[PDB]
Write an enzyme that holds these catalytic residues in place. Structure first.
Site, mmCIF file in Angstrom:
data_model
loop_
_atom_site.group_PDB
_atom_site.id
_atom_site.type_symbol
_atom_site.label_atom_id
_atom_site.label_comp_id
_atom_site.label_asym_id
_atom_site.label_seq_id
_atom_site.Cartn_x
_atom_site.Cartn_y
_atom_site.Cartn_z
ATOM 1 C CG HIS A 174 -26.223 -2.050 -6.930
ATOM 2 N ND1 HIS A 174 -26.588 -1.847 -5.617
ATOM 3 C CD2 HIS A 174 -24.868 -2.013 -6.953
ATOM 4 C CE1 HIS A 174 -25.504 -1.692 -4.878
ATOM 5 N NE2 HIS A 174 -24.448 -1.788 -5.664
ATOM 6 C CG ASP B 229 -2.233 0.802 0.903
ATOM 7 O OD1 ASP B 229 -2.807 0.554 -0.175
ATOM 8 O OD2 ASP B 229 -2.670 1.651 1.716
HETATM 9 MN MN LIG Z 1 -2.438 2.743 3.602
HETATM 10 MN MN LIG Z 2 -4.011 2.295 0.060
#
Ligand SMILES: [Mn+2]
Ligand SMILES: [Mn+2]
Ligand SMILES: [Mn+2]
Ligand SMILES: [Mn+2]
Ligand SMILES: [Mn+2]
Ligand SMILES: [Mn+2]
Ligand SMILES: [Mn+2]
Length: 1156
Positions: free
Chosen positions: A717, A7
């Protein structure tokens, strides 16, 4: 064997390692500290927190003019190395002459060149179009100008008509703009953007005209400011973003990249792709203009000729009609007339403002006024209206000039691909003149160093004596003279010395002054003089260059100096002989020179070996479009990836998944949409518009969308989740099963409801796409869905994937094809988010920093699973060249996938819009390869287990700042900490002992900010400064409490006791490590005060409680009515007996120094 997940963020980098069955490996690591702890077990998962501050890494990540200078210089060096051999045949001093200054060695070629080629573009076009052979120097001049200013590389492909299409790029801009503002999208509809933007009108007029086609948009609005950016104007974005300070932007400005980076540093990196889109639009306008040989050079020549005929016409007019103003207009640099525009400091705006009244009062010609209003009156050569040119144009001129001249010059044909590669690919100095005095000295000394003369090997005093008494006195020294000089058996020499100080004697006969030559201080002057004598064959040029030294010499001496000329060039740079030091090489000669270079004991070898390479990664990152923080994060991801490579025994990961996305105003957007939508056709304030059901309520005017029955205030949806995941309001609708019917979009029987949808459409209450969806599923739409879910539009992530790919793949096969050991996957954030949602893997940012690591783990899981399931789709989300498979073929009839949701394979059973359920096999696997991709009964358990484990490597990066202290060194009369300012630090590095003695020895321990220390019951502390400490602990919570907090805050009432259990855990933690009992008492008391409150708000305030336990600097936080003030650890005395923990960037490699 394994794959890495990441990340990536502006202040953190989560990382995780993963095996084929998605397990996270445990591994032992050595502990280097003196403490009796020799190993540690650690999971290969964690996160790296980091500050955005003034460090050496930060400045290394900024653009600098010097780095660009050295870059272009290196490219030109590579160009000259190819040209050097033939150029020696044409003009030996040509490359040395280059940086008015003379390109040529004589006045005739120079003046003829400047007369024939007033601008470089004339030379470029002539070299492109003419079939005639041209001088090699001219071809070099064109290729050098093209390679030097290559332009941008935003367009990866060979240039194609879509690139110059203004309409398509306009639609691109509107699209990337709409992505950032789902609430108030701009509708391009049928707007003739090409005709408006390419119209021959003032840019401001084109702006007003284009905005006239977009209702509800003002000129000052963000999109209008972007259009103004594209047209060539200078919009200020500070009003658009409520910035504290001015944020003007102009693409033509040299600082625009850094300026845009500042703006991104303020408003966030999400907007970077938007501005890149505006720049692409500007490029489309300029490209369409130059396209309607060498069109660029031709357009520049056209601007030149137009400028000149306009100039002579204006001159004739001003002569005929307003003679009094003529001198002021054409000769006065101080004034804003033409003289001040060309050679004064006047902007085109100031100049046009000056001549506008004058051209009108003139009545001599109005066409010049027409060119003026269109801002095409007297354009300079040194401008491109808001834009850097794409490299493909210069490349096309490159191929043209090379292909044209390759027949006459075979080496061009041979090196053609190399020359193009120089422009496309992403010691230092020139040699001394052969007859330079320093060079002749170096040669005679280098030969003299090795002379045997053994009797019944030459001394340095003997060397200087031999040079002063023989080489200086005689123009050449025969060996018999050396023997007779020895008198007043030799070896290492032949009948006569071949080296001689010929320049010393030539200059001796002319200067008639031995001391001036013998003096060392004058040597730079003499070097410049001989360099002048070699540089030019023409006397006027030599005289002009020699005029600087005219005071030193007699007039007759100068007139004699002009005659002498040298024609050779040496093999070595001046600084290799006398610049580099140990003691210069010439000092050593006064051991062979070659032996001198190859001695490891001497520094010349190291300095040269460094010089061949003498940072590129920080530089490449520096030129990316983004905030300093995100770039620093990219750097950290690179370093973390290298360390994870080292941890795994140098074996490359099979895969690397990467994710980069951002981790009040929207309520205002929704408020504007509701207000306008209501005004077009139970009041409540905006803050609750965040609620989906309420915002959907107001969007639908208090009415059901499917049934035509108004709804009381006290969701489905349109295109079903099985086909694609779109939780956006564009696809969501509030309802009573009623209208949805079957799996197909809302039923045709319910499409009779469409008129209300149309009234919502013209009200802006619903988007046109939502209307098109409500009115409908084609197979092509499915192809669009599958293409949509996988591709990552963000540009910076593409650059990160490219960087990681270059770092991971260097080897080439015998066919010169790349050997791609590693795939660099780039996931959309939404896939991992929805993966967390569907399978109840809840995230809470405030409990700890663990969520970054958990995110990287889930990234590697979903990414590797997605590749294993759909190898054919590899082109869509893996860096590198891959076949783009026929997407329709993998889409299937009802018997890859019939349902277009790519995440569907994770589910055991899929719920359709009608409520019917499609069961799926417990083990998902690829049919083509036979490989298993997912095991619903086992792998999900492994995921919950990975998220559940308390041990995760959180590392707050230590940093050295560059009244500010860089670092705090421990000092040992008695133990104590002392700060070290950047001003103090240099003299500190030079003689640390005398400095410490000045303040008042075996151990030198510099402690960087956020240095980690441990003491007592698992407690940790970071050194924010010599005067203050930050919390070093990461409170871990059992996953049950985390999911309970998520579920309660996002409101199982029976699990109410978990509140008390959580508060008990936070209190036990706070007493074990936080040590702020006076605040904790207030917290527990306030918890007793509001037990009556509903569990939702209770859980939210418990979520607020976590800031007390948070790692890093203490901060004030509100718990219900009560506010808790921050508690600073202002005493650092406890650290002195604490055990320091030096961390690896991953934190896997610790060194624990305990001193007490
Ligand atoms: Mn993060
Ligand atoms: Mn992230
Ligand atoms: Mn010579
Ligand atoms: Mn009502
Ligand atoms: Mn939420
Ligand atoms: Mn809150
Ligand atoms: Mn209260």
């Amino acid at each position: 064997k394994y794959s890495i997940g990441l990340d990536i963020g502006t202040n953190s980098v989560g990382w995780a390692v993963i095996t084929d069955e998605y397990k996270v490996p445990s591994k032992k690591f050595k502990v280097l500290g003196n403490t009796d702890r020799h190993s540690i077990k650690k999971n290969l998962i964690g996160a790296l927190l980091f500050d955005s501050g003034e460090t050496a890494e930060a400045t290394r990540l900024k653009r600098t003019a010097r780095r660009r200078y050295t870059r272009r210089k290196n490219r030109i060096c590579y160009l000259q190395e190819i040209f050097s051999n033939e150029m020696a045949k044409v003009d030996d001093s040509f490359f040395h002459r280059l940086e008015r200054h003379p390109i040529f060695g004589n006045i005739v070629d120079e003046v003829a060149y400047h007369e024939k080629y007033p601008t470089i573009y004339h030379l470029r076009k002539k070299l492109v179009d003419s079939t005639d052979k041209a001088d090699l120097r001219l071809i070099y001049l064109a290729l050098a100008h093209m390679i030097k200013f290559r332009g941008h590389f935003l367009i990866e492909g060979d240039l194609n008509p879509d690139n110059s299409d203004v309409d398509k790029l306009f639609i691109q801009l509107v699209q990337t703009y709409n992505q950032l503002f789902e609430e108030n999208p701009i509708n391009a509809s049928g707007v003739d953007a090409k005709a408006i933007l390419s119209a021959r009108l003032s840019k401001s007029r084109r702006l007003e005209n284009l905005i006239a086609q977009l209702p509800g948009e003002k000129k000052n609005g963000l999109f209008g400011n972007l259009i103004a950016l594209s047209l060539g104007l200078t919009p200020n974005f500070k009003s658009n973003f409520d910035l504290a300070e001015d944020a003007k932007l102009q693409l033509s400005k040299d600082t625009y990249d850094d300026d845009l980076d500042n703006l991104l540093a303020q408003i966030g990196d999400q907007y970077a792709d938007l501005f890149l889109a505006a720049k692409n639009l500007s490029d489309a306008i300029l490209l369409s203009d130059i396209l309607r040989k060498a069109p660029l050079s031709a357009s520049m020549i056209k601007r030149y000729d137009e400028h000149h005929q306009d100039l002579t016409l204006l001159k004739a007019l001003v002569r005929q009609q307003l003679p009094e103003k003529y001198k002021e207009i054409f000769f006065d640099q101080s004034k804003n007339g033409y003289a001040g525009y060309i050679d004064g400091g006047a902007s085109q705006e100031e100049f046009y403002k000056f001549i506008k009244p004058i051209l009108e009062k003139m009545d001599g010609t109005e066409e010049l006024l027409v060119k003026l209003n269109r801002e095409d009156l007297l354009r300079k050569q040194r401008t491109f209206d808001n834009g850097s040119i794409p490299h493909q144009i210069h490349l096309g001129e490159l191929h043209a000039i090379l292909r044209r001249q390759e027949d006459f010059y075979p080496f061009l044909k041979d090196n053609r691909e190399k020359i193009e590669k120089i422009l496309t690919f992403r010691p230092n100095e020139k040699v001394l003149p052969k007859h330079s005095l320093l060079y002749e000295y170096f040669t005679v000394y280098n030969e003299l160093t090795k002379v045997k003369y053994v009797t019944e090997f030459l001394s340095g005093e003997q060397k200087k004596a031999i040079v002063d008494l023989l080489f200086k006195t005689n123009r050449k020294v025969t060996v018999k003279q050396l023997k007779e000089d020895y008198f007043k058996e030799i070896s290492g020499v032949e009948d006569r010395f071949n080296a001689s100080l010929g320049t010393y004697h030539d200059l001796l006969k002319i200067i008639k002054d031995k001391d001036f030559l013998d003096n060392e201080e004058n040597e730079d002057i003499l070097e410049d003089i001989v360099l002048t004598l070699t540089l030019f064959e023409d006397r006027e040029m030599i005289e002009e260059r020699l005029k600087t030294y005219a005071h030193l010499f007699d007039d007759k001496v100068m007139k004699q100096l002009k005659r002498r000329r040298y024609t050779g060039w040496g093999r070595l740079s001046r600084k290799l002989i006398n610049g580099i030091r140990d003691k210069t090489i010439l000092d050593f000669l006064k051991r062979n020179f070659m032996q001198l270079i190859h001695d490891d004991s001497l520094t010349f070898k190291e300095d040269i070996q460094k010089a061949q390479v003498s940072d590129s990664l920080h530089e490449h990152i520096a030129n990316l479009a983004g905030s300093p923080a995100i770039k620093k994060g990219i750097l950290q991801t690179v370093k973390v990836v290298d360390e994870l490579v080292k941890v795994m025994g140098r074996h490359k990961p099979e895969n690397i998944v990467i994710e980069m996305a951002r981790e009040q105003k929207n309520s205002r957007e929704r408020m504007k949409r509701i207000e306008e939508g209501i005004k077009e056709l139970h009041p409540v304030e905006n803050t609750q518009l965040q609620n989906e059901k309420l915002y959907l309520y107001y969007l639908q005017n208090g009415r059901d969308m499917y049934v035509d029955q108004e709804l009381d205030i006290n969701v489905d949806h349109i295109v079903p989740q099985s086909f694609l995941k779109d939780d956006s309001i564009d696809n969501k609708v509030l309802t009573r099963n009623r209208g949805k019917s079957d799996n197909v979009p809302s039923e045709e029987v319910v499409k009779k409801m469409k008129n209300y949808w149309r009234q919502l459409l013209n009200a802006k209450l619903i988007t046109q796409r939502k209307f098109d969806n409500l009115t409908k599923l084609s197979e092509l739409d499915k192809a669009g869905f599958i293409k949509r879910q996988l591709v990552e539009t963000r540009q910076i992530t593409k650059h990160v994937a490219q960087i990681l790919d270059s770092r991971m793949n260097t080897k080439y096969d015998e066919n010169d094809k790349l050997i791609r050991e590693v795939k660099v996957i780039t996931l959309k954030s939404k896939l991992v988010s929805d993966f967390r949602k569907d399978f109840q893997f809840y995230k809470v940012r405030e409990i700890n920093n663990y969520h970054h690591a958990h995110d990287a783990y889930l990234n590697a899981v979903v990414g590797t699973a997605l590749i294993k399931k759909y190898p054919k789709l590899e082109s869509e989300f893996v860096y590198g060249d891959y076949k783009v498979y026929d997407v329709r073929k993998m889409i299937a009839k009802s018997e890859y996938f019939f349902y277009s949701n790519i995440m569907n394979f994770f589910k055991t059973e899929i719920t359709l819009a009608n409520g019917e359920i499609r069961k799926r096999p417990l083990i998902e696997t690829n049919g083509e390869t036979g490989e298993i991709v997912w095991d619903k009964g086992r792998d999900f358990a492994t995921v919950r287990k990975v998220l559940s484990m308390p041990q995760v490597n959180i590392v707050k990066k230590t940093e050295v700042q560059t009244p500010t202290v860089a670092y705090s060194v421990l000092v040992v009369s008695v133990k104590e900490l002392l700060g070290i300012t950047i001003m103090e630090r240099s003299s500190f590095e030079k003689n640390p002992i005398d400095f410490l003695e000045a303040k008042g020895k075996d151990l030198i321990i510099k402690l960087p900010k956020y240095s980690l220390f441990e003491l007592e019951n698992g407690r940790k502390r970071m050194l924010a400064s010599a005067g203050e400490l930050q919390k070093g602990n990461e409170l871990a919570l059992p996953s049950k409490y985390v999911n309970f907090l998520y579920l309660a805050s996002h409101y199982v009432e029976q699990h109410k006791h978990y509140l008390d259990e959580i508060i008990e855990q936070i209190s036990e933690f706070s007493k074990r490590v936080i040590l702020a009992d006076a605040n904790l008492d207030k917290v527990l008391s306030a918890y007793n005060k509001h037990r009556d409150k509903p569990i939702r708000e209770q859980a939210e305030n418990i979520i607020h409680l976590f800031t007390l336990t948070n790692l890093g600097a203490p901060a004030a936080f509100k718990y219900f009515d009560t506010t808790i003030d921050r508690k600073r650890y202002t005493s650092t005395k406890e650290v002195l007996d604490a055990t320091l923990i030096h961390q690896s960037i991953t934190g896997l490699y610790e060194t624990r120094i305990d001193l007490s």
